[PDB]
Enzyme design. Structure first.
Site, PDB file in Angstrom:
ATOM      1  N   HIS A   1     -12.560  31.310  -4.483  1.00  0.00           N
ATOM      2  CA  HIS A   1     -12.517  30.601  -5.758  1.00  0.00           C
ATOM      3  C   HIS A   1     -11.084  30.319  -6.198  1.00  0.00           C
ATOM      4  O   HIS A   1     -10.855  29.747  -7.264  1.00  0.00           O
ATOM      5  CB  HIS A   1     -13.257  31.390  -6.840  1.00  0.00           C
ATOM      6  CG  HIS A   1     -12.494  32.569  -7.358  1.00  0.00           C
ATOM      7  ND1 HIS A   1     -12.492  33.791  -6.723  1.00  0.00           N
ATOM      8  CD2 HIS A   1     -11.711  32.712  -8.453  1.00  0.00           C
ATOM      9  CE1 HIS A   1     -11.739  34.638  -7.403  1.00  0.00           C
ATOM     10  NE2 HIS A   1     -11.254  34.008  -8.457  1.00  0.00           N
TER      11      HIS A   1
ATOM     12  N   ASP B   1     -18.220  34.582  -2.228  1.00  0.00           N
ATOM     13  CA  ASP B   1     -16.873  34.199  -2.632  1.00  0.00           C
ATOM     14  C   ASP B   1     -15.825  34.732  -1.659  1.00  0.00           C
ATOM     15  O   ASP B   1     -14.983  35.551  -2.026  1.00  0.00           O
ATOM     16  CB  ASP B   1     -16.583  34.704  -4.047  1.00  0.00           C
ATOM     17  CG  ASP B   1     -15.343  34.074  -4.649  1.00  0.00           C
ATOM     18  OD1 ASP B   1     -14.941  34.494  -5.754  1.00  0.00           O
ATOM     19  OD2 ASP B   1     -14.773  33.158  -4.020  1.00  0.00           O
TER      20      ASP B   1
ATOM     21  N   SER C   1      -6.804  38.803  -8.188  1.00  0.00           N
ATOM     22  CA  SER C   1      -7.927  38.093  -7.585  1.00  0.00           C
ATOM     23  C   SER C   1      -7.702  37.869  -6.093  1.00  0.00           C
ATOM     24  O   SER C   1      -6.636  37.413  -5.677  1.00  0.00           O
ATOM     25  CB  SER C   1      -8.157  36.756  -8.290  1.00  0.00           C
ATOM     26  OG  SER C   1      -9.248  36.059  -7.714  1.00  0.00           O
TER      27      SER C   1
END
Ligand SMILES: *[C@@H]1O[C@H](CO)[C@@H](O[C@@H]2O[C@H](CO)[C@@H](O[C@@H]3O[C@H](CO[C@@H]4O[C@H](CO)[C@@H](O)[C@H](O)[C@@H]4O)[C@@H](O)[C@H](O)[C@@H]3O)[C@H](O)[C@H]2NC(C)=O)[C@H](O)[C@H]1NC(C)=O
Ligand SMILES: *[C@@H]1O[C@H](CO)[C@@H](O[C@@H]2O[C@H](CO)[C@@H](O[C@@H]3O[C@H](CO)[C@@H](O)[C@H](O)[C@@H]3O)[C@H](O)[C@H]2NC(C)=O)[C@H](O)[C@H]1NC(C)=O
Ligand SMILES: *C1O[C@H](CO)[C@@H](O)[C@H](O)[C@H]1NC(C)=O
Ligand SMILES: [Mg+2]
EC number: 3.4.21.47
Lengths: 106, 91, 190, 48, 507, 48, 47, 84
Positions: free
Chosen positions: E267, E317, E440
């Site tokens: 993402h 993801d 992330s």
């Protein structure tokens, strides 16, 4: 030598400067033993009466070869013309630990 | 110890928002700006404090320089940071 | 003090030089050294030699010190003596503590001492002695080594079998005997 | 400043002489570990 | 200095001094400096024939380098750990020559026959004495005897100085340093003399006495010495950057999975982002690396729920990034271990028959799992320990996704939180730290057996406790973190990393 | 307010400095005829 | 030890005294600029 | 108690900063085991200068040794990055 040669009619004589410095650049303090002589093709004639012992302060020394001694070295100034002179110095530290022998010829 | 608060308010008496200005600050002998508070004002937009001024620690930082990108001409642009006492000396 | 020195030579030649030394005591500056044939050592050191209170504890401590390398109960077999140093061919009757020298019980290890130490311990013949020294006292190259009776060499007279009966040598016979067992099976306290 | 040192070689071969020195108050020092050849007693010759 | 590879057998002769000059305070600490060693040695995979001999006046052979159990670290540790100081208190003598004399027999083959490829075996003697030795001669001669047995320093072009590494640890207070050095091996640019003070901060010590020549490839391996930079502790860690018009700069992280690939969240990128707008920074060096292509997971889709009311769909993801240039593994650049691979098998020290399921049980048991995620605080790679809610609290943790932004009007929670997700954070059983935007794509690692195995990939969170360039103060109890389980995307990683020679399990 | 910059261009030696502003009847500062206005600051090497 | 000086055990002596070293070989394949390549070597000066 | 004074602060701060380096001295000193003799020679000398300066509580010697010990540390840090 002050001049890269010698003028036969030069009253002053052959002036030679003895510069001694350590490998790391610092100046050297000691005493030097300088002598002279004449060369002829391959043969050399030492001049015992030219032996000097000059001090070496600030890493520098001053020695002179009077024309008087030079001529007395032989037995006709115009004759010596063509020949060559060689200087043989020998510096010794004030500690007497090390000793170096230099030489300028031609 | 005593730890006080220094508040600064300024405004430009012009018709246009003054461009890039400078804030020259001089501490009270024995006072140093709070490091954490400086990071806050630094990260904020329209304000800038050179890295050179940052890592000085309470010790040597008696003089401070806060670069401003602009100052309003209508109302007052006010900022404030904490200061600590580390030297203690009468008068 | 360190012996002085004077050197003479011409300015044109350094090789052909002569140097003499001088010392208020020593011969002519030349240091003190023991030499045989072509094997010399730095004899610049001290000597080694009224029975204070040698006890069982006084030995266990001095026989477990750092330099302590070898400990034997030897018997002097032959005694030779030269004009520059004496020596003693002693045979090991037991190895109380094996050192850097691999020697079995029975072999003979040569000991060497200065001629001035003839008054230290008159090592008579066919007598036993308890000795221990440092590894820095070894002399020569293996297997042909040689011990040196130096300052750190412990020389003690070991009474005979029928001598411990004397009511004056008993105090030493019991200490030596106990020192033996306290070394073979036990060891140093460090 | 020269510092004399009297020594006597005992074993032949490339031996090692080492000297160290440090100054008081100043935290400086320098040791030198040079090696000199120890040759027995003989003279060069080339018998035919 | 000390070769380290299963491509050849090795030997570790552990000699320990137990006389009075050592003391109980340093003898007990002397064992710690051998126990932790065996662990850090076995962590590399090598299987040395350990030898253990405690000595005073008469040594005591605990373990022989000829036994069949001399290769089981777990047992050798047991023996060493059980070794009580006062095993011989009567003979406080310090006969070192005798101890080394016994070690000679350990390598002394039975008579006229040289064993199979004997010379290829390495020999390492680790004597831990105080130099102060009374009984015996000079242990130096023994080193000279062994010097010949192993045929060392007896040939011109074949010195064999690589098969003898003698280390000496100066235990006890007053120690004769002059003596120690003579015993220790004299090798250039190497260290073999360690003293008392060196003990504290052991990691620094182990560094010198270890060179990972052939373990430069081993994954999940980390140096912990204090003199080690952040990337000396997290070699796999990678900093990815995305530059694009009006995009300012997007910050993400990743883990080196192979020489050419870097694993990170899917993402963080998009079909729009080009291959020269994405730069990967491996370790330390601010030298960006151009990528070749971003391999998005076929099942990835953030807009798969344009109808149900789920603005963002984080299912599957994961995305691999094949670098344009091949990486050379270093102390600051090493791969991390991936689930269901040959690497993880030997990393966890399990039999060659280890199935893909057995690993999922060991790594991700049904309970509260000890995990961690790497995060940067002021340009500093700090470790954050968290817990994985894989037990019964899995439901109580995953149901907290109803607090996430744009996740209020959701039909079902099993629609947004797919089985492809692991859950962390919260206040039970412990106050687990939280992941920020910069983190992330970070790896979810399970520290086991001195190794590091990745079992998750930071996908998203419920609450941004990491406001902006900060994180703390008042964290909600429903602040949960979700990561993509690497076991749920095995077939994919098994497809792209097929030529990376990792050794995935066909199972 | 007047500035008084103290420069220190030593290699690696931060200086413990004692600066004082002499009194002058022409000016009115913390320094008086019987009171000395002196600080004791420290300056990092190669800086001001 | 307590003196304002350095002990003997803390003085590492200089031993490397070569007469001729740096007998190496280097190739200039670096990115050329104006036909002049530039290699930066990190040598280890002797004692 | 209230606060420090003139020589009460700067003299203490320098002491703490010097101590911070001295704590990880064994760390850096042992890190030269694989490096050259230069680093091993420079750190063993710059090591004492920092210790002797600490106990003396002399502002001059502490600072003089702080950078003396800080320099060698940095030179070691760079000496390791060529080795990875
Ligand atoms: C075999 O043995 C012979 C005899 O020892 C060795 O010959 C000697 O070797 C050296 C090097 O070749 C010679 O040195 C040279 O010496 C010459 C001549 O000597 C000079 O004589 C004249 C007149 O008296 C004067 O200039 C001086 O007195 C001087 O000594 C010299 O001109 C050169 O500079 C050179 O140094 C040496 O002469 C010679 N000695 C002899 C022949 O007796 C030889 O090296 C050795 N090796 C082999 C295998 O042949
Ligand atoms: C191994 O042996 C060494 C040497 O005996 C031991 O070091 C000693 O450790 C103790 C406990 O840490 C130290 O005591 C401390 O004293 C200081 C004051 O100097 C004090 O501030 C501390 O609170 C503590 O009381 C002691 O300094 C030290 N002895 C020394 C260095 O002479 C060590 O404990 C043993 N263990 C290992 C494996 O290191
Ligand atoms: C032993 O090792 C050497 C060096 O690797 C090798 O050349 C030789 O083949 C091996 N065999 C023996 C026992 O010499
Ligand atoms: Mg002992």
């Amino acid at each position: 030598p002050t001049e890269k040669f010698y003028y036969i009619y030069n009253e002053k004589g052959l002036e030679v400067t003895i510069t001694a410095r350590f490998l790391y650049g610092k100046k050297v303090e000691g005493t030097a033993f300088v002598i002279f002589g004449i060369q002829d093709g391959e043969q050399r004639i030492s001049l015992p009466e030219s032996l000097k012992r000059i001090p070496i302060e600030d890493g520098s020394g001053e020695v002179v070869l009077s024309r008087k001694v030079l001529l007395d070295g032989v037995q006709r100034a115009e004759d010596l013309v063509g020949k060559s002179l060689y200087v043989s110095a020998t510096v010794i530290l004030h500690s007497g630990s090390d000793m170096v022998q230099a030489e300028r010829s031609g | 110890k005593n730890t006080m608060i220094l508040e600064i308010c300024t405004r430009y008496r012009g018709d246009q928002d003054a461009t890039m200005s400078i804030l020259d600050i001089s501490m009270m002998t024995g006072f140093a700006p709070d490091t954490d508070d400086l990071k806050q004002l630094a990260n904020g937009v329209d304000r800038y404090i050179s890295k050179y001024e940052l890592d000085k620690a309470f010790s040597d930082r008696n003089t401070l320089i806060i670069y401003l990108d602009k100052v309003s001409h209508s109302e007052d642009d006010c900022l404030a940071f904490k200061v600590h006492q580390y030297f203690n000396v009468e008068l | 003090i360190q012996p002085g020195a004077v050197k003479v030579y011409a300015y044109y030649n350094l090789e052909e030089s002569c140097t003499r030394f001088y010392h208020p005591e020593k011969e002519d500056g030349k240091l003190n050294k023991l030499c045989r044939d072509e094997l010399c050592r730095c004899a610049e050191e001290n000597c080694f030699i009224s029975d204070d209170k040698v006890t069982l504890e006084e030995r266990l401590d001095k026989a477990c010190e750092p330099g302590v390398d070898y400990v034997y109960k030897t018997r002097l077999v032959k005694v030779q003596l030269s004009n520059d140093f004496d020596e003693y061919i002693m045979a090991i009757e037991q190895t109380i503590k094996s050192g850097s020298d691999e020697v079995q019980v029975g072999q003979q290890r040569t000991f060497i001492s200065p001629i001035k130490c003839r008054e230290a311990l008159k090592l008579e013949e066919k007598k036993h002695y308890l000795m221990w020294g440092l590894s820095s006292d070894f002399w020569g190259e293996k297997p042909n080594l040689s011990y040196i009776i130096g300052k750190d060499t412990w020389v003690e007279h070991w009474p005979e079998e029928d001598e411990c009966q004397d009511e004056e040598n008993q105090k030493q016979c019991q200490d030596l005997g106990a020192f033996t067992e306290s070394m073979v099976v036990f060891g140093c306290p460090n | 400043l020269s510092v004399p040192y009297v020594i006597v070689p005992l074993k032949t071969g490339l031996q090692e002489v080492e000297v160290k020195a440090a100054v008081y108050h100043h935290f400086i020092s320098d040791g030198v570990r040079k090696s000199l050849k120890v040759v027995p007693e003989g003279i060069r010759m080339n018998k035919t | 200095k000390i070769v380290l590879d299963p491509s050849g057998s090795m030997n570790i002769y552990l000699v320990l001094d137990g006389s009075d000059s050592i003391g109980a305070s340093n003898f007990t600490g002397a064992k710690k400096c051998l126990v932790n060693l065996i662990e850090k040695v076995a962590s590399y995979g090598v299987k040395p024939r350990y030898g253990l001999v405690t000595y005073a006046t008469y040594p005591k052979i605990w373990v022989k380098v000829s036994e069949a159990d001399s290769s089981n670290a777990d047992w050798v540790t047991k023996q060493l750990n059980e070794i009580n100081y006062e095993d011989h208190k009567l003979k406080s003598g310090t006969n070192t020559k005798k101890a080394l004399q016994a070690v000679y027999s350990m390598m002394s083959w039975p008579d006229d026959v040289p064993p199979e490829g004997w010379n290829r075996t390495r020999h390492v003697i680790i004597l831990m004495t105080d130099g102060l030795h009374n009984m015996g001669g000079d242990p130096i001669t023994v080193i000279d005897e062994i010097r010949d047995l192993l045929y060392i320093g007896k040939d011109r072009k074949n010195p064999r100085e690589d098969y003898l590494d003698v280390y000496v640890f100066g235990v006890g207070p007053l120690v004769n340093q002059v003596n120690i050095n003579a015993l220790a091996s004299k090798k250039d640019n190497e260290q073999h003399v360690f003293k008392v003070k060196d003990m504290e901060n052991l990691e620094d010590v182990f560094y010198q006495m270890i060179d990972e020549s052939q373990s430069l490839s081993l994954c999940g391996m980390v140096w912990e010495h204090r003199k080690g930079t952040d990337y000396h502790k997290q070699p796999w860690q990678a900093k990815i950057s995305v530059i694009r018009p009006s995009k300012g700069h997007e910050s993400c992280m990743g883990a080196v999975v192979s020489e050419y690939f870097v694993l990170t969240a899917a993402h963080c990128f998009t079909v729009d982002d080009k291959e020269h707008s994405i730069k990967v920074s491996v370790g330390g060096e601010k030298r960006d690396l151009e990528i070749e292509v971003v391999l998005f997971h076929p099942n990835y889709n953030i807009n798969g729920k344009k109808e149900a009311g789920i603005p963002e769909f984080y299912d599957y993801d994961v995305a691999l990034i094949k670098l344009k240039n091949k990486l050379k593994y270093g102390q600051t650049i090493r791969p991390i271990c991936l689930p269901c691979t040959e690497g993880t098998t030997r990393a966890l020290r399990l039999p060659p028959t280890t199935t893909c399921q057995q690993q999922k049980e060991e790594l991700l048991p049904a309970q509260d799992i000890k995990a961690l995620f790497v995060s940067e605080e002021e340009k500093k790679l700090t470790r954050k320990e968290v817990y994985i809610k894989n037990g019964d609290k899995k439901g109580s943790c995953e149901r907290d996704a109803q607090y996430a932004p744009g996740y209020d009007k959701v039909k079902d929670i099993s629609e947004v939180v797919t089985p492809r997700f692991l859950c962390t954070g919260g206040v039970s059983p412990y106050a687990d730290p939280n992941t920020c935007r910069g983190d992330s794509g970070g790896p979810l690692i399970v520290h086991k057996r001195s190794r590091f195995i990745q079992v998750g990939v930071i996908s998203w969170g419920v609450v941004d406790v990491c406001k902006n360039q900060k994180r703390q103060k008042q964290v909600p109890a429903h602040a949960r973190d979700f990561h993509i389980n690497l076991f749920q995307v095995l077939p994919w990683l098994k497809e792209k990393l097929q030529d990376e020679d990792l050794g995935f399990l066909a199972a | 307010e007047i500035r008084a910059v103290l420069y220190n261009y030593r290699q690696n030696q931060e200086l413990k400095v004692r600066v004082e502003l002499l009194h002058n009847p022409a000016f009115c500062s913390l320094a008086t005829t019987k009171r000395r206005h002196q600080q004791t600051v420290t300056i990092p090497p190669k800086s001001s | 030890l307590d003196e304002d000086i350095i002990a003997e055990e803390n003085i590492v002596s200089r031993s490397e005294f070569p007469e001729s070293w740096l007998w190496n070989v280097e190739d200039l394949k670096e990115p050329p600029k104006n036909g002049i390549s530039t290699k930066l070597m990190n040598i280890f000066l002797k004692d | 108690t209230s606060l420090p004074t003139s020589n009460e602060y700067q003299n203490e701060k320098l002491a703490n900063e010097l101590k911070s380096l001295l704590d990880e001295l064994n760390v850096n000193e042992l890190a030269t085991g694989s490096l050259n003799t230069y680093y091993k020679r420079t750190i063993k000398i710059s090591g004492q200068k920092a210790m002797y300066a600490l106990k003396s509580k002399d502002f001059k010697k502490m600072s003089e040794a702080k950078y003396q010990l800080q320099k060698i540390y940095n030179e070691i840090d760079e000496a390791l990055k060529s080795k990875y």
